[PDB]
Each structure stands twice: as C-alpha cells, then as structure tokens.
Ligand binder design. Sequence first.
Ligand code: CU
Ligand code: CU
Ligand code: CU
Ligand code: CU
Ligand code: ZN
Ligand code: ZN
Ligand code: ZN
Ligand code: ZN
Lengths: 151, 151, 151, 151
Amino acid sequence: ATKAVCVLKGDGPVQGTIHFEAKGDTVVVTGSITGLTEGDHGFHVHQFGDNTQGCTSAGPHFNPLSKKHGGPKDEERHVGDLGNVTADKNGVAIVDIVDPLISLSGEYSIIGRTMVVHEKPDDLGRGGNEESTKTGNAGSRLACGVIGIAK
Amino acid sequence: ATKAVCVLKGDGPVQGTIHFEAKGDTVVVTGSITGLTEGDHGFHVHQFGDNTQGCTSAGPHFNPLSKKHGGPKDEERHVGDLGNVTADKNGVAIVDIVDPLISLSGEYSIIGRTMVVHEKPDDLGRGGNEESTKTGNAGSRLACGVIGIAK
Amino acid sequence: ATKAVCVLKGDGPVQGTIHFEAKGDTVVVTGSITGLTEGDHGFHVHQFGDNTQGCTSAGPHFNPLSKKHGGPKDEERHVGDLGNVTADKNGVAIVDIVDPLISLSGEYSIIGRTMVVHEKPDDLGRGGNEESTKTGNAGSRLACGVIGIAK
Amino acid sequence: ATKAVCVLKGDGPVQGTIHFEAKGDTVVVTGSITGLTEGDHGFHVHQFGDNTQGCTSAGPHFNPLSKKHGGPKDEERHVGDLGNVTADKNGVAIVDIVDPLISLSGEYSIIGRTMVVHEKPDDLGRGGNEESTKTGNAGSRLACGVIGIAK
Ligand SMILES: [Cu+2]
Ligand SMILES: [Cu+2]
Ligand SMILES: [Cu+2]
Ligand SMILES: [Cu+2]
Ligand SMILES: [Zn+2]
Ligand SMILES: [Zn+2]
Ligand SMILES: [Zn+2]
Ligand SMILES: [Zn+2]
C-alpha cells in the first residue's frame, strides 16, 4: 500500500480524518482534527488496531526498536512518535507531518495499527520524569482509529 | 502478525467483535455479532480500510485474483468471500470460519481492510443476476470495521 | 432464455416494443416507446403477468428482496426499478438500460411479468411522501405488456 | 410459479382468459373464450411470447422434445398440444384441461410463451397429410396472449 487512511473517533466530540501517503522513503501524514482545546496535542501511532475497549486497547506507542519516547526529530524515539498537532481557537488542527521512520509497508508498517490524538501536549521526552520517557505526558486518548489501506 | 481483531459498528443496533488467528497454514475466524435479524447475513472482507463515509467507503470485495463472487467453498470466489454468518432468534451470530484464501501478512493480508456484515443472506454467486456475481445480493452494509493487528 | 420481448399497449396512444437480452452476466434492455408526452416516464417491472384488468392487475413492483422503491443505481430499490425513460418532443423514447438486478431465468427472472411505462417521472424514491417509497410518484400506467420468451 | 394467466386477444372479436394452476405433476387449465364459431377449435401453446407482429410472431408449437404434432393424449405430440376447446351455439367455450406435459416451471415451462386459439378443429395428427403432422390443420390464429405469472 502507498495510501492509507484513519478516521479518529472517541467518546467525546473530538473527531477527524488522517491521510497517509508513501513518498520516497517517507510517509506524508495530512488531514484535520476538530473539537480540540486550543494548543498542542500529542499525536502517536499506538501498537494495536484493537478498539474492543476503546482507545485504551490500542496499547502503548508502536515501538519495534525498543526505545524510549521522544520527539519525531529525536534519535531516541518510538516509531509511533509523531510529536504534536496544533489546534487553533476554533478547535481545529490541520495535520501536515513528513516522517522517515513510520512506513505503510514492511517492518515499520503502521497499517492495522492505531492513530491517537491526546489530551495534552507531548513534552517530547524532555519533561524530567519517568512518564515523559514513556508517553511524553500527553495524557488521555481523546480519539483514535485503526489505520487502513486506502484507494 | 499472527492475530488480528475487528470491531463492527454501523448506523443501527448491529455490533460485534471478530478475531482472526494464523494457525498452522490457515486463518481461523471467531467472534460474535449481535442485534441482527434472525437468519443468514453476508460476511465479507471489503477492499479498503476506509470508514470516511461509513461502510460505503470500504469499496468492493477484496479480490486480488480478479475473480467473480462466490461462496467460500468455491474455486471462483473473491478472497473476501467468507459466505454467511447465521443469527439466532435473539439476533446473535456465533462466528466460526476457517479460510484458505485470506491471510494476516503478504499478498492475501486482510489487515487494514474492512470486515462487513450485510443486511441479507449471501446467495454465493448463484442468484442469476449480475449483482450475484459481485456481492451475492447481500445488500446493505449493516456494520463494519477496519481489521487491526491484535496482541 | 437469453432473449425476451415485450409489446406495450394501453387505453391511449402509448405503444412500443422492448427487447431484453442476457449478455455476459447482465441484461441489456433496448427498444422504443411512442405516443408519450415529452420528458421522463417511470419504467418498471411489475410483479404479475396479469392483464385481466389492463395494467392494474400487474400488481406492485417486482420486489423479491422486500425493499423500498428507489432508482436503478440505488442499493435500496426493487428489482423492477429501472428508473425513467425519456421522450423527446415528438413523443419518442429510445430505451437503453443495462441492469444488475433483473434476469431472464431463476429467482430474478422477469419473464412472465409486466413492463409498465408510467404517466409521470419516477422520483427515484426521494420524493418524501409514502408513495415515493412505493412507486416514485410515477402515477398511472399508460401502457404495459407481459414479458415473453423471444427467438 | 404455481399460478399463471393469459388474456387472449386477436384482430377480430375472439377473446378470453385462461388460468393455469400447478397441481401434483400436472397443470390444470381453465377459463373461457367468447366470440367463436360453434364447434371445436385447436388450442395450443406456441413457442414464443412474441406479439410484435400479432399471433404469427409466436412461432410454432412449443416443442422441446422435437416431435410431430398429435393430441394431448398421444405419446407423439408437441408439449404445446392441448387438443380442442369446444364452443357452443352462443360462441362460448369453457376450458377445462388437465395436462402432465406442460409445466409452469423448469424445462417444459410455458411461462413467457403464447396460448393460441385456432380457426378450425385440431385433427390431432390424424388428418393424413403433412400439415396434420405439424399444426393438426387448425388453421389461422384467432386470438393469443403471452402466459404470465399470476397472484
Ligand atoms: Cu500516544
Ligand atoms: Cu460484502
Ligand atoms: Cu411502476
Ligand atoms: Cu397452434
Ligand atoms: Zn512514544
Ligand atoms: Zn464477493
Ligand atoms: Zn419500485
Ligand atoms: Zn402441435
């Protein structure tokens, strides 16, 4: 697959759609998310496309290299670490990410996994506590969806 | 990926969880669907893991061998042709399928695609109209979900 | 039966010949209707090949899947829902339909049933009254005939 | 179908309605025909439900076993060979035939074919000439109709 899609849904008003496209050795991640409080929100690929108990059953960050949490620009990061998306005053975030580590095929493929938008900003591993090194202190899972093959 | 899961949701009361497991050289499909009308309902892997327009955006049946619609025992069938699930009088269908065409990795992978439960029985491609050769006259898509990697 | 024919007759000037042919996996509908008013007229397979009370005794639309009335492109439609034919200013309609639900043998066969051309356009089940969900508000039956096996 | 109907019409005053009902391995043929000259009239299922050029376009006797013409009681007969109906002095014939060879379903089905009442008596193949072995010398087609599925 060179194209993928994710519909983000949660138990509150947060929703959106994310598009994924293979370009060179990168994945180009675009889309939009509504209903968010203004400011940054952690945005991560979680390990499992399991929504049986909601976003919680997606498990931790997709992490096949067994590293600690960081920002997308960091060497020490989880594959699923895409940093922050930014909502404006209207609650809307436009997603425009280009990432070399995630993939839509092969070993680091995110097809069949879960995209999650978080309650709080991702501190990118620089928070000075244990949690920062795990989730970036991004807190609760506002909305999520399984990543699917798109036409 | 040796285990997958799917959570089925639609516009109506129909819901359920489908489990997939790679066992030996085959794929075992289990789970249950509730809120169905008594009797048979088409049960198919649709091509796209795309829920942007609910179940409609899943596209046609997964069909990488470019065949006509059939039953799961037929040579001429789509890879996604898993026949019928059967609901009892309480609207409950127990899912128990072993299938030789689907997989959980490589060309035949259904990870990132869509499981659909239909309004009507699948006629296994033997209805005698053109629709039968496409969908088995299974009709509308009551509920669907993207197939995700499971723990 | 791979070819069928229908001769349309009514109480007024409306007449025509409709040809049906099983081609590939589908049914191609051709022919022409004359004596019509300019514009659209509902064109439907009615259930009974019964002309004992003219076109009235043909009964409702052929509907073996127990659905509501729609257009021929719709999922929710009767098997007999072939939409509209269009008459030009001289009252002539050229019939050119390919249809996935009708057949010329087996469950979906329209052989021995009735082709009806209606007074008014078919609203494709979107008119918003109850009648729309039955007949598309197509109104009276200008002309009809029993579908017969052709050489 | 277990029930069928035919409205007989022609270019003259002969008309009637014929009813067909599946009973055991027979079809029970009933109805009435008016406007006839007193005496016997050949009564046959013709091959095609094609009325585009009137009764003539119905073609020959329905004959899927490729036999010669006889009476309904004869081994050598066409499937469409139902013998004679008898008009009284008032021009009225009451039809009451029970036949094992015609069918309303499967290979010998007469649904979509044509019922014809003839000018002259059917000589039942015993006329001593070539025509007798083809049509029973029943002569012209007074009235006919396509056989349709009835409620
Ligand atoms: Cu996260
Ligand atoms: Cu399907
Ligand atoms: Cu109609
Ligand atoms: Cu004859
Ligand atoms: Zn992380
Ligand atoms: Zn199929
Ligand atoms: Zn209709
Ligand atoms: Zn004969």
